[PDB]
């Protein structure tokens, strides 16, 4: 699985959530609506199929 690190930027998570292309958007430990109010020390985006 390809791990891509995201750090030191401004993330807009609402555009991903409101997009209808995604079948399932399951958030554990956070709620997707609140995602824009939060500040994270690090983000890891692991991609695969």
């Amino acid at each position: 699985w390809n791990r891509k690190r995201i750090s030191n930027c401004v993330a807009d998570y609402s555009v991903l959530y409101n997009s209808a292309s995604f079948s399932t958007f399951k958030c554990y430990g956070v709620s997707p609506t609140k995602l824009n109010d939060l500040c994270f020390t690090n983000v890891y985006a692991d991609s695969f199929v």
Partner: protein, 43 residues
């Protein structure tokens, strides 16, 4: 509603239907009944 949104009609669910259309409370005492009505469309 749509078939895939039938899970959104439940307490403590997140989605377009839950937040913008029909919000059930966390302490929802009740029942939810859904049947596929593919007989009765831009209305």
């Amino acid at each position: 509603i749509r078939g895939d949104e039938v899970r959104q009609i439940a307490p403590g669910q997140t989605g377009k239907i839950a937040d913008y259309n029909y919000k059930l409370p966390c302490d929802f005492t009740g029942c939810v009944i859904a049947w596929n009505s593919n007989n009765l469309n831009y209305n």
